[PDB]
Amino acid sequence: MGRDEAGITGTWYNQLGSTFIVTAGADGALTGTYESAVGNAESRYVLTGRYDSAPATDGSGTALGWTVAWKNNYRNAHSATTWSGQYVGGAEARINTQWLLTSGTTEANAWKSTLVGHDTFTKVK
Amino acid sequence: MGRDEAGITGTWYNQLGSTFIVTAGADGALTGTYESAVGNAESRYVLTGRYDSAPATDGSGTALGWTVAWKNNYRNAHSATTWSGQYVGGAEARINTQWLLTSGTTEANAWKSTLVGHDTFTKVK
Amino acid sequence: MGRDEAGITGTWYNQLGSTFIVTAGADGALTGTYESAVGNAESRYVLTGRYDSAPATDGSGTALGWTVAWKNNYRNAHSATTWSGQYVGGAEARINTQWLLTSGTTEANAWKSTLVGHDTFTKVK
Amino acid sequence: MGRDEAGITGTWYNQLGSTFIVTAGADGALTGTYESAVGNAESRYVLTGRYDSAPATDGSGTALGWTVAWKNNYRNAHSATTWSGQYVGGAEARINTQWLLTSGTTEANAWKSTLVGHDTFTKVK
Ligand SMILES: [Cu+2]
Numbered sequence A, B, C, D: 001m002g003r004d005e006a007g008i009t010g011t012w013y014n015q016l017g018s019t020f021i022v023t024a025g026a027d028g029a030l031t032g033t034y035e036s037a038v039g040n041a042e043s044r045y046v047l048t049g050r051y052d053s054a055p056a057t058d059g060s061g062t063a064l065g066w067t068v069a070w071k072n073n074y075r076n077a078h079s080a081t082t083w084s085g086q087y088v089g090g091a092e093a094r095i096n097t098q099w100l101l102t103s104g105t106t107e108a109n110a111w112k113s114t115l116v117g118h119d120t121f122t123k124v125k
């Protein structure tokens, strides 16, 4: 029922070699797993997020976001990343994101708690 | 079972007058609703996210994040915000965040798609 | 000649206890020194930046930004911070900023090169 | 005298078609002009910034940053962008950046004052 439900659902890969597996729900839900090719991470982590299930029909992308807390049965990196971005459909479909990775810190170290970057996800590679 | 499950669960208010209502699950899940006092928003929006359910015990905060897609039964702002931050417990408990708000745009306008800011949430006011 | 040339010029202090000393030029130039209370820093560092020397007169703030490269005669932290923000005049004058702190890294570590945060500067404390 | 003084100095182009012309000083100064291919901008704007004039020699990039206030003789967009990033030398030399673009706003609208993005600059195209 969601406009890009079919387009978003599936496996995505970013420029670092990380793998994102997501199911988009009719209502706007995103659920899946994330596996990072870098950092203090191993195997799959739970992700959850939201997307605009009724986007503009004027060539605009579809806004979405999701979160991974970097705790699973193997490791705990005491941190969470949120990706905020848009899905762009078509022959070379893309999810273009910026992200914020916050670590748990003392109050004294909170100024250096948050990394920022950008990931581009594609259906191939 | 989550260390700050009790501490995170409940109603939070930020510096803009927005209201965040969240339930923290034992496993790391965050579920709830968000009501923004500003922007192209009215009433409650679904949120989902994740938190570190077993944080460090050295005075460090608890990493977490969540997403709101700004579509509900009243409005659709074709955008999504992700908050990335940490929960700090105690007498004046806080969730200190930075956020990324991405709008759906054409490819030509993608350079101006994403706002960034910071929200501090407290249990009062 | 710049509208907030007088208002911006002088000594500013942020929430971390850092000290910013700046001279605003008529043309839009910012020149001065920065001393950080935190991180891999000691004593004063050169800063340079720019501000809007003819801002809107509708209660709006004055856009500005500046850069510090964290090399001086004492230390080199192989990094640079840029602050982007606005000056708000009046009895409790403020410079409200967000910043990006990029470290020199290998290409493999570039994903974790950039910290993000927010500093508020006041004329007192 | 600066390690990458020669490498940084010159004309750079980003993915939007914008042109950055910079001179790197021996001491760490960056001076030049910026011409944006997008947004509320026309012709050249003054930029100033800083770079690490003695970077690490372990394959690491060179940290740098600069600011443009979007006022010149043609237009005033009541805003300033800061780019924070690193210069990576070699056959395909790059300046990889993230940026913050703050507009002058009322206090009520300050939450939506700041855009964030990322630009990659190359010596060709
Ligand atoms: Cu619409």
Ligand SMILES: [Cu+2]
Pocket: A076, A078, B055, B056
């Ligand atoms: Cu631990």
Ligand SMILES: [Cu+2]
Pocket: C055, C056, D076, D078
């Ligand atoms: Cu004007």
Ligand SMILES: [Cu+2]
Pocket: C076, C078, D055, D056
């Ligand atoms: Cu060194």
